Design a protein around this ligand. Structure first.
Ligand code: NAG
Ligand code: CU
Length: 227
């Protein structure tokens, strides 16, 4: 359980969607982060993979604001303290807004995977995962925006999948957090995109899995990494 509290881009903080404050406020502030109804700080499990909730989390609506990023620039997402127990991958996708991200229909967004990190080491099952990397970096993740993509407005869908309960059907816990970016530079790729509702299925090999046993491999869920 947790959420993204802050985003660091080009030397300033863009405050996150503080899901334990703003839902209680009813004139809440404008941010680059999508609003959600996930006030339990919880997840979308396999029962929700083909619902709109998977796209940018439960009840999500676009952020009003969009943050410019320098070409090949970093976006650092700062989480609330991630529990060691919640082992699993950290996955990052972009979808083009083809206009202002604040007015997009999230159900039409087509995501391409720009980064994925999975099982890092399995010397002591359940092992060391991308989520443990995030903990070791004091609960932050650095995303580098590719220089080879067509610049424009994009949703960054940033996600931890916790697998501590994933040996049961619909046990995997997805924690998607969306923010609005203005990608800048000279690139031209328009990578093939996947609907939010086709990212994951509740029987995928990296989703329905027992992490407590020795693992010979881990198949990071979602569509193929764009390079
Ligand atoms: C996180 O930062 C705090 C100090 O602000 C420190 O006490 C903790 O050990 C840090 N680093 C790691 C690897 O957790
Ligand atoms: Cu949790």
């Amino acid at each position: 359980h947790g959420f993204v509290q802050n985003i660091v881009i080009d030397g300033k903080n863009y405050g996150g969607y503080l899901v334990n404050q703003y839902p209680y406020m009813s004139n809440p502030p404008e941010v680059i982060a999508w609003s959600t109804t996930a006030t339990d700080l919880g997840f979308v499990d396999g029962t929700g993979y083909q619902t709109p909730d998977i796209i940018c989390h439960r009840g999500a609506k676009p952020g009003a604001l969009t943050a410019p990023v320098s070409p090949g620039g970093t976006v650092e997402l700062q989480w609330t303290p991630w529990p060691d127990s919640h082992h699993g991958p950290v996955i990052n996708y972009l979808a083009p807004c083809n206009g202002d991200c604040s007015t997009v229909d999230k159900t039409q967004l087509e995501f391409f995977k720009i980064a994925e990190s999975g099982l890092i080491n399995d010397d002591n099952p359940p092992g060391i995962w991308a989520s443990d990397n995030l903990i070791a970096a004091n609960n932050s993740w650095t995303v580098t925006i590719p220089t080879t993509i067509a610049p424009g407005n994009y949703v960054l869908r940033h996600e931890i999948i916790a697998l501590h309960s994933a040996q049961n059907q619909d046990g995997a816990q997805n924690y998607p957090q969306c923010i609005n970016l203005q990608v800048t530079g000279g690139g031209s790729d328009n990578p093939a995109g996947t609907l939010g509702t086709a990212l994951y299925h509740d029987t995928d090999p990296g989703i329905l899995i027992n992490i407590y046993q020795k693992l010979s491999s881990y198949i990071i869920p979602g569509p193929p990494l764009y390079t």
